[PDB]
Amino acid sequence: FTLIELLIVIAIIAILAAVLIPNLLAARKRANDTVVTAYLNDAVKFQEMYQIDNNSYTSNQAALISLGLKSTPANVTFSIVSASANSYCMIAGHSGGTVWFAATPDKGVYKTNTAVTSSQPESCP
Amino acid sequence: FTLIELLIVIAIIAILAAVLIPNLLAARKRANDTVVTAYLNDAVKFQEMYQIDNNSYTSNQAALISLGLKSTPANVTFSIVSASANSYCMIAGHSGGTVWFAATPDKGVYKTNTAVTSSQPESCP
Amino acid sequence: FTLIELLIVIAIIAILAAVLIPNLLAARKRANDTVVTAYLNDAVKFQEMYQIDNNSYTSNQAALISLGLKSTPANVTFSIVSASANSYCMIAGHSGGTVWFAATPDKGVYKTNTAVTSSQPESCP
Amino acid sequence: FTLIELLIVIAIIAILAAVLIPNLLAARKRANDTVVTAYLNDAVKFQEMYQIDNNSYTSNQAALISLGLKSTPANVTFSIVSASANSYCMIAGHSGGTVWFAATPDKGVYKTNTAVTSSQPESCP
Amino acid sequence: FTLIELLIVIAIIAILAAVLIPNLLAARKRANDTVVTAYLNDAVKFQEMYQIDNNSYTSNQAALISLGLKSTPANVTFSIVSASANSYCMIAGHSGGTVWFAATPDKGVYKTNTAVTSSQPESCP
Amino acid sequence: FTLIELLIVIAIIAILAAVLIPNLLAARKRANDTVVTAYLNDAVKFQEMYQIDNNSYTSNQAALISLGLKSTPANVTFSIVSASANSYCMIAGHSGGTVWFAATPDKGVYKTNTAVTSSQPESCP
Amino acid sequence: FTLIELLIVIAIIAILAAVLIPNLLAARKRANDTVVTAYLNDAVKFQEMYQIDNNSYTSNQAALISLGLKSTPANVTFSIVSASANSYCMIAGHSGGTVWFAATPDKGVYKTNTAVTSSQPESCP
Amino acid sequence: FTLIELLIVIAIIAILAAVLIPNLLAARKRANDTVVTAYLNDAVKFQEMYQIDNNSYTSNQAALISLGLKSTPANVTFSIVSASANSYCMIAGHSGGTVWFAATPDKGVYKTNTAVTSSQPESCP
Amino acid sequence: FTLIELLIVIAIIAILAAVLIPNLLAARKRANDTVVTAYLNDAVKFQEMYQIDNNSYTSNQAALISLGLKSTPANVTFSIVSASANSYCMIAGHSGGTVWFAATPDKGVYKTNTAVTSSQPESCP
Amino acid sequence: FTLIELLIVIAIIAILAAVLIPNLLAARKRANDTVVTAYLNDAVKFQEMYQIDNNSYTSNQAALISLGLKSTPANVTFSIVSASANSYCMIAGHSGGTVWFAATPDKGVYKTNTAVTSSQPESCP
Amino acid sequence: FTLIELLIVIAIIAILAAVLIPNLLAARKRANDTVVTAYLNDAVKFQEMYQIDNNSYTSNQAALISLGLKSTPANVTFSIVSASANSYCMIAGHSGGTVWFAATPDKGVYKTNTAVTSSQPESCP
Amino acid sequence: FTLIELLIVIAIIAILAAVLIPNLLAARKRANDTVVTAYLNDAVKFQEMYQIDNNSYTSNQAALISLGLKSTPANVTFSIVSASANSYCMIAGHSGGTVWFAATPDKGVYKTNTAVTSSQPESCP
Amino acid sequence: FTLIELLIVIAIIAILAAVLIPNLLAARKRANDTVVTAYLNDAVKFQEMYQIDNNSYTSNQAALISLGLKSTPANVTFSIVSASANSYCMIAGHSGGTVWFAATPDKGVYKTNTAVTSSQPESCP
Amino acid sequence: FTLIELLIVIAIIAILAAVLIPNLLAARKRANDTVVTAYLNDAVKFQEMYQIDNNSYTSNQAALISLGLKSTPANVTFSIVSASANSYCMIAGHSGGTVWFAATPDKGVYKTNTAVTSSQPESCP
Amino acid sequence: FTLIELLIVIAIIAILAAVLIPNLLAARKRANDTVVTAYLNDAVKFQEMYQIDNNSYTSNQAALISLGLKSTPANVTFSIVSASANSYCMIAGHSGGTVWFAATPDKGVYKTNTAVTSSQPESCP
Amino acid sequence: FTLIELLIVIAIIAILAAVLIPNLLAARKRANDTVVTAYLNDAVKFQEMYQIDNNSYTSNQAALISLGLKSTPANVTFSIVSASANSYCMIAGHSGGTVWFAATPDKGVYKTNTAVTSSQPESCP
């Protein structure tokens, strides 16, 4: 067991420790988008359930939570823009996500061009 | 269980969440037309019942409701234009519908070219 | 139970609601003519009953009503034109009827070319 | 086959059931007068037949019935007032008729101003 | 086939189940009036048939039934008020109808202001 | 257009089909009596015409038919009982009538207590 | 889009497929009664038309069909019991109906206690 | 609201639309016979009125119309065959009737075996 | 959340998307027959209304439309074959229906063996 | 394949397992309301079928089941409050539903303010 | 990067590969029931369409397929037991399903106690 | 920490990197089919919505998009073959899918034998 | 090859053997949570499958295992707290995990504050 | 630099060369199990993909390889036992592994008691 | 301490210095393959992340680096051959490695027969 | 044994004692880098474990140690710069190492240009 045989093993550990460790930040961004997309997909369901009861759409979040929807997820900024009798607009996004996600009845849940680092969209596209 | 196998599953969920969610706003428009058509179809019946009693047609809605007709539905703007001894004209429409629906004795319950976003028709075609 | 199966059912209800509802205004016009023809047919009888008593025909309606004839029907404009010792002429019509109906002893109760929308005939044909 | 098509048919039956049914009470009054006039016309004949036999007129009804005259009709109040050698007076009337009918030789069978609801005339005009 | 696509279908079924189901109670009221009007119209005929036989009108119902008239209909309170030699008065009404219907010879079969919930009229107008 | 709206329409048709159809058998009985009364009234006339020619009354029917009287009507049993020089007796009745009708010169054409279901009267009352 | 979200959607489809599908067999029974009642109502009319021509009622069906009546409907057992000069009795019923329907002139078209599964009534009540 | 519930409702409407619609052509034939019988009954009256004036019967129709008789009805072929001093023969029939109707003084107004589709009878039976 | 759990969910969506989507073309065919049957049922009514006015049946469609009948429906080929004084024949059919529907007074509105893909029937059966 | 690459995959599975699993309890509540609404909609139909037979409404459930209605569904408390000759009131609700559903003829099938956790309504609004 | 760090990663992959892979066979059973329920639900519709045409129910499957129904699905044993004029019985089941599904008009499409591993039910419950 | 212990760890990473990485291309093909099936399923809905408005089917895509349908998905070649008044044919497929998918009203959305690498089908099977 | 060169190699092996060996106990805790989360996620699925069959939720585990669920995993304490008709509560945890995991329908599968070293939660939060 | 200082260094190299060299054969066994588990996990996926296409499971391996699955790995004996329409059984194992691994849909991929030195299992547990 | 004892120690150092020094070049080759395999394994992940965003695969490397991928490693020649919408091919290799490594979606990351001393492969196998 | 033979042996020991003793300080520097790289590699793991629990990254070291991470190694200056919700930066270095080592999620554990003799980096590159 030489020093050179130990020294080359130390050299390879430095190489393997760099390359084999994956990009963590990028992997979480897409998982964070799934949380935003899932919560908006759930939000659309409980909007339709409130439409059965009251014949309208909710401006406030507490109305949707009372019917059955969960509380806002960790590091997520859910915010309903507006809700008329026969329409709605719900913007939501994760802090370390990719982009903001809108949610309307005609277009469904989709993603906008605005970044999560930038400010919240005033109205959905 | 790799990261790539998880990553592609996250990618497919984003695709399925977009395409499988149907157009909600469009689906409700036709259901809203059925509510307007049904209420006008009911309104025509209670107009004929008032014709049996009083030998005339009602200008006011409260006369039709007293005989048996239900109250005006949620997000519906029912409004009788005019009602002579031997005729009537009743316009009605949903706020998030397609178009206004007229209701006369000779033509029955039919739909007009005027949109629900536009103002109420003054007289039926 | 799909959305398309519900959507086609909504489409067929719109078709059935248009075609199966009959022409109400036209149906009442002929029933209104029967009321005018019946009242003139009754008016001819009580004219003959007054002829038994007084040996003449009545100019006024109150004389015919005193013998037994009913009051003028709802939305009907009965009006005796003239009544000599050995003749009479009685025009009558419904507001939402087809045409005016005359009533003389020689021709009986018949219908004239003048429309109910137009003014009352001065004398019977 | 709609409910509205059935409902309007029910409405027209109510109209036709009112107007087409004639005045029954008035129609019978004139037929009842014919029964009184016929019985008095027959009574005058059998008075002349008794004049051939006895050279006088009958006070009692049974004398006229013995010669051939029929019994008093149903709901008729026949009553001979007086009968001298060369004259007679016979009042008669139906209960649901118009007026009392007299019967003398000089004037024949005629009708008086006294109503059938009012009491019987003591002597003929 | 999403949950939201099923959920909106459940929402529309709730709307269609409310509006498309017509007013049953009101529809039967007018049909019940036709039964009362028809039975009184039949009762008037068999009163005239008894007038041919007996020269009077019937106080009891069993006399009219013996000639040919049907038994009293289900949930109908037929009742002859009075019947003189030359007149009659017959009140009748359905339990779940609109109003009581009278029947005299001079006025025919007509409807009175008294309601079926209220007590039976003592005499016809 | 619901199933319940169709089902109630089927229910009302069953009610209207029962009540509005009149008693046919009873209506024909009185018309059949008019045929018997008319034929006996005609038979009395041609008996008087034979009295002008032969100075007697006919026992056989063929003698009356030769003068001008029509043949016996359908479902009618005309039969002359007896005919002396200065009198006659003629019984007649319809198979589906009410009662047998006699016909003598002194009493005219009248109806007897014997029913048409029962056997023919041997002699008139 | 989870498996549990798909699995619950499959569970609700099984529930909706059971409850929303109406009772078809029961719905047709009442429609089948309308066919029997309508055909008997038509049969009564053409019996009266044959009475105008021949002065009797038809035993055979071919006589009624020659005048204008339609052929026997599908899955209906029409059968005239008897037909005298002044009466008739016509039993008819659908194979998958409720009960047999009689048809006489005095009682009109009515339904009997005998079931369609049981044998045909020999004579009407 | 299922498709099957709508589909069975469409099936029942097809059944009810066939059976409930009565035979129109046959119903009019008997009404057309009444028009021919009425016009011949009127023609017989004005023949007797001409007999009072001229001591004969009319060959031409214009003579009867001048006295008071109406013009020939729509779709009716009135035609007087012959008219001697003390007799007459008048054939008449509707185009869509049953048979030709004769009219003589001895037999009155009666119907012949010749059909309306076949040619006009040369002389009355 | 595995790939296999996502993959089986994709497999079930393909199965549910095939089986749950109903036959649309077949469902519309019967609704299209109702439109043709309803329009012919309406056409028969306005033919009878023209018969009241003119004492004949219409060859042209514009005469029926002037009285009150609606315009020809979308994708429907209405065409009156012939119309004599006392009869008519009206063929009609939808482009994507089942068969052509005839309409005569004696047989009512019925369906023929000729298919809508095949040419129009020259005359009704 | 590092431990950190496995560890982050375990972290994302925990996130996806929380968010993607939908609210099951809320989804079933609306499906349970459809079962109650469907059963009451069916109950209203068989109430009208009993009205055809007996001319009344059923207090007991076994009468409705004998006509054709299904047995009470699983975890549903159907209960008829009252049923007069011309009216009815039927309360029903699911154990894990939203609210109780009433069912009257005038208002149809509707939902009340009373919760399914709370006790059954004594009478419908 | 040690061997122990690789060895524990291999150990966790074995654990995750067992637990995260769901029960595939059970998931397909319920999807297979949906295919059987959907095909029977479709089969019930085309049975009603054949009832409109032929006034009966089909014993053979080829008759239902000719109207519009699809071919039998993969690994499904559809088989109509019997079909009278006013009823039917249709058993069907998937090879890897749960139980056999019946289909009658009165009970609708329901599931029986017989297993798919066991033989086909001879008649529906 | 030997070189051989590092060397075997490098050897196992090469094995795990090959086997644990799943088939990505195959996984996307089935997800791409879901996008095509979903878009055709949506296309069928908006074809029925255009049928409600215009009483026909659309040849152009822009008509369906104006009603509410989304734009064509990424790497998808949607193309309507033909659209008559009462039918349609819509072929669609993904570039990296499995096969082309047709969409007609009678057969619904189904997959054809033609591959996505091969050219587009001219007409649907 | 000196002793000092061997001695420093022995010194570095002691350093590398300490630092490079990862925390095994902590790595397994999160993998153990995945086993508990996966088994509860599977348990929720088979609870919904039992809800399809029996219309309730299971108290016992053997009912869920009979449907298809696997046996309880090694070193896992699965235990269903309660299961009403329309709800359930299932606590589960690994012996060397982090915390207990609950599982209800409304909240899904989530983790509680109670530690695995501490006793089992009596009811879920 | 003594001989004893060199001699002890030679002695320590002999000790370090024995202890520091790990068990290679045992380390590969678990890596070989991962290859078998991964290939069976992949085999289960492509079995579900063939189920989408053909509605069955594959007996032959070439069918799975054609869809996308890789060739059999080096020193691995993959072998499908049986594959019915709704099930499968796939045994596989490495030559220098631990035990044979089965793969069914209900149990997933699991390991059996049979050793790789022993013969292949005939059927999976 | 002799010269011979020193001389033999010098002789053994020459032997130990030859044999104990391992093959360095060969040890690095396999570590260099791990760097290429790791970078391609990372490259495959960021290709799937670009597929989520743009619905395609990247031809240029800068697109993958912008998403999160690291810069090309030292002495590594990464080069994307081609990238269509639904596929890709990425060759990469180390200068002192063994062979070139390809990377496609269907086959994953694998090694080719071409040596690193030889030129770069034009397309992947 | 001469003095010169001893003297040359003393001379060679001085030469061998200089050359054969390796560079100790340099050998430890690379081993010290492995300790820093290993501790940062461990620190990255327990940062991801805290992200599972709290949905954030730790600023303090005591939070990471509580989860399972070891205490700071001897002669190592670990120090977390900052830690937002979705990112972190951790600098660490040995006193007798080469350079400071950073540790972020996107770049992994890498080495910076700053020397260990120089002061600690304020933020990672």
Residue numbers in the entry:
A (entry chain L), B (entry chain A), C (entry chain E), D (entry chain B), E (entry chain F), F (entry chain C), ...: 1 to 125
Sentences from the paper on this structure:
Type IV pili (T4P) are flexible extracellular protein filaments found on many bacteria. They form multifunctional fibres involved in twitching motility, adhesion, immune evasion, bacteriophage infection, virulence and colony formation. Pilins have a conserved N-terminal α-helix, with a 4–5 stranded antiparallel β-sheet at the C-terminus. The α-helix forms the core of the filament, while the globular β-sheet head domain is solvent exposed and subject to post-translational modification.
Our data unambiguously demonstrate that the wider pilus is composed of the major pilin PilA4. The diameter of the wide pilus is 70 Å and is roughly cylindrical. The region between the N-terminal α-helix and the C-terminal β-sheet, the so-called glycosylation loop, ranges in PilA4 from amino acids 55–77, with a two-turn α-helix comprising amino acids 61–67. The C-terminal region is an antiparallel four-stranded β-sheet with the last strand facing towards the N-terminus followed by a loop that ends on the β-sheet. A disulphide bond between Cys89, which is located in the second strand, and the penultimate amino acid Cys124, likely stabilises the C-terminus. PilA4 has no net charge but the filament displays a distinctive positively charged groove along the filament axis. In the wide (PilA4) filament, each subunit (subunit A) interacts with the N-termini that project down from the next two subunits above (B and C) and from the subunits which are six and seven subunits above (G and H). PilA4 contains two intermolecular salt bridges—between Asp53 (subunit A) and Arg30 (subunit D), and between Glu48 (subunit A) and Arg28 (subunit E). The surface of our wide PilA4 filaments show a striking line of positively charged residues along the long axis, into which a double stranded DNA molecule can be fitted. In summary, we conclude that PilA4 has three known roles: it promotes pilus formation for both wide and narrow filaments, it comprises the main structure of the wide T4P, and it plays a role in natural transformation.
